[PDB]
Amino acid sequence: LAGTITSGWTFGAGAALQIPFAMQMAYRFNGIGVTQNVLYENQKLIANQ
Amino acid sequence: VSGNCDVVIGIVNNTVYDPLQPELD
Amino acid sequence: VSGNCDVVIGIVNNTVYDPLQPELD
Numbered sequence: 773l774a775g776t777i778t779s780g781w782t783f784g785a786g787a788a789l790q791i792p793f794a795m796q797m798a799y800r801f802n803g804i805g806v807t808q809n810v811l812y813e814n815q816k817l818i819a820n821q
Numbered sequence: 822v823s824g825n826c827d828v829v830i831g832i833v834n835n836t837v838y839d840p841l842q843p844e845l846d
Numbered sequence: 847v848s849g850n851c852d853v854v855i856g857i858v859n860n861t862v863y864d865p866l867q868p869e870l871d
């Protein structure tokens with residue numbers, strides 16, 4: 773859990789790399805077909821949910 | 822360039838290179 | 847763009863505005 777929140781998916785495939793969580797969500801959103809802009813703009817709302 | 826500069830929590834004022842405009846001129 | 851208009855089925859008309867032309871003019 774600690775690795776996932778801080779390093780995203782980097783720890784699984786190699787030495788862990790630190791990335792901001794907000795940024796990690798943007799990357800993850802990209803994977804599902806939703807653009808990065810939606811996450812930052814709705815970051816307050818997404819966090820609440 | 823989607824969005825306006827009030828909705829992001831983390832931001833910086835770095836200048837965009839904007840390479841395309843000079844060529845058009 | 848991908849070739850002639852006629853081959854595609856369900857194609858609808860109207861404008862496809864492009865940024866470069868305005869600056870040039």
Ligand SMILES: *[C@@H]1O[C@H](CO)[C@@H](O)[C@H](O)[C@H]1NC(C)=O
Pocket residue numbers: 830831832
């Ligand atoms: C945390 O990050 C935000 C941007 O997301 C920034 O505005 C703020 O200054 C930072 N605060 C600390 C304590 O790092």
